[PDB]
Amino acid sequence: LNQINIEIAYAFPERYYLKSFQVDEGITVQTAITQSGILSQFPEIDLSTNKIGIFSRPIKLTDVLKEGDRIEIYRPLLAD
Amino acid sequence: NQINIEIAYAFPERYYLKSFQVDEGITVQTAITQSGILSQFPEIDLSTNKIGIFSRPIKLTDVLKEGDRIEIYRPLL
Numbered sequence: 001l002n003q004i005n006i007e008i009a010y011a012f013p014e015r016y017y018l019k020s021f022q023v024d025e026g027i028t029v030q031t032a033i034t035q036s037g038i039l040s041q042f043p044e045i046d047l048s049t050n051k052i053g054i055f056s057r058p059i060k061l062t063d064v065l066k067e068g069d070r071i072e073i074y075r076p077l078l079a080d
Numbered sequence: 081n082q083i084n085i086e087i088a089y090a091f092p093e094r095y096y097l098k099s100f101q102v103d104e105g106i107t108v109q110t111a112i113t114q115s116g117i118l119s120q121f122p123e124i125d126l127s128t129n130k131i132g133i134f135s136r137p138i139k140l141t142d143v144l145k146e147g148d149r150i151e152i153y154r155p156l157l
Contacts, residue, residue: 004146006146006149006150007147007148007150008152009151010151010154011153011154027144028140028144029140029141029150030141049155050155051153052140053134053151054136054138054148054150055134055135055148056134056135058132058147060108061108062107062108062109063107063108063133064106065083065085065102065106065108067084068136068137069085069086069135070087070133070134071085071111071132072088072131073117073130074089074090
């Protein structure tokens with residue numbers, strides 16, 4: 001079964017949730033969320049109505065844009 | 081037949097953000113060349129810069145791709 005890496009983020013103000021998981025390719029947004037445990041840690045999250053976006057990277061520049069998409073361009077390296 | 085999109089370029093001294101209307105069906109690359117951002121910032125390199133796409137709303141049924149970050153928001157304000 002092909003494996004991909006995904007992240008889930010949720011900003012519990014003054015202690016952020018930010019976790020990466022290895023998952024079976026084919027998993028949906030709802031399945032990743034419900035299988036992570038995030039809903040047990042934060043029982044105030046309501047998937048029927050909570051607002052959810054996805055940050056995708058890397059992408060192919062040939063991908064088709066949709067309403068409300070933001071393209072973020074940034075630098076891989078710091079310094080001065 | 082149009083859609084509203086944004087393009088941002090984050091660098092150390094400034095955050096650039098611009099909103100555009102473009103033809104439904106446009107690719108990321110066409111949007112970038114169309115925006116004139118590459119003339120404005122000659123240092124942007126399409127093979128070297130990080131480039132990602134933020135999408136919202138999604139669907140709970142969307143199939144995840146490699147490197148997708150699901151962001152769950154707390155209701156405002």
